[PDB]
Amino acid sequence: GDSFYIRTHFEYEKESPYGLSFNKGEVFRVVDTLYNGKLGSWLAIRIGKNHKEVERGIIPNKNRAEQLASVQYVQTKFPAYERVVLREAGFLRPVTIFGPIADVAREKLAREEPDIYQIAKSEPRDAGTDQGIIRLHTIKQIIDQDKHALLDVTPNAVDRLNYAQWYPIVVFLNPDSKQGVKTMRMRLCPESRKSARKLYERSHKLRKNNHHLFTTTINLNSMNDGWYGALKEAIQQQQNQLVWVSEG
């Protein structure tokens, strides 16, 4: 009927009780432009995980959206509202893992299921640059071999991969505590020189500023290695979901 779907690329807080707040990356079915946006608002429905219709309310219209997005430095080449469409994944999506044991995760998957997973090589970081590592061709080589490319990349790389329509599966491994991290590292990678504190602080930063890129989250129990079996199921489950893709 009337409706179309959008993806937000700005954070917004409702100033009306009939409104809906949103984070970046949230999808909405715009159900009614409410007199062509002339009241400043649209009627939208929030789409939940497994694409179910969760909450209904008013959001800003396109003009006010574009205007609200001007003020936060959110470094994004995306429109404030992106026109968006559901599609079955037409290839094996690259997999990005974040959190205090993502390196162990990557290594274990590539070692134990070499037929399903392969670590994509990354470019050396250049001395005297920012906080372009994996080239697109490298990922294509792995995709064409019927495998998931494991990517050791930056949140900004993920954003960029989203923009180029490569839509990685992004898993966050959530730590219980700093101590938890230390304990898991002793058991899983005692040779590692990386700092448990640094990795824990980096995850807190990741969760707080960047949660909107996560496709899915697994909570770590530092007592046991159950996170691994759950990692393998989560990626398969994610690969089997329809994807929100840019329209046009």
Q: What is the DSSP letter of 68?
A: H
Resolution of the solved structure (Å): 2.6
Report the b/e string of 205-244 with b at 16+ CB within 10 A.
Answer: ebbeebebbbbbebebebeeeebbebbeebbeebeebebb
Helix (H) or strand (E) holding 91: none
Contact assessment for residue 93 and residue 239, using Cβ atoms and an 8 Å cutoff: yes
Q: Is 11 helix (H, G, I), strand (E, B) or coil?
A: coil
Domains of the chain: 1-89+240-248 (2.30.30.40), 90-239 (3.40.50.300)
Residue matched to tokens 């079915």? 29
Contact assessment for residue 44 and residue 31, using Cβ atoms and an 8 Å cutoff: yes
Q: Strand 4-8 relative to strand 27-32: parallel, antiparallel, unpaired?
A: antiparallel
Vertex 97, ends 209 and 106: CA angle to 5°? 155
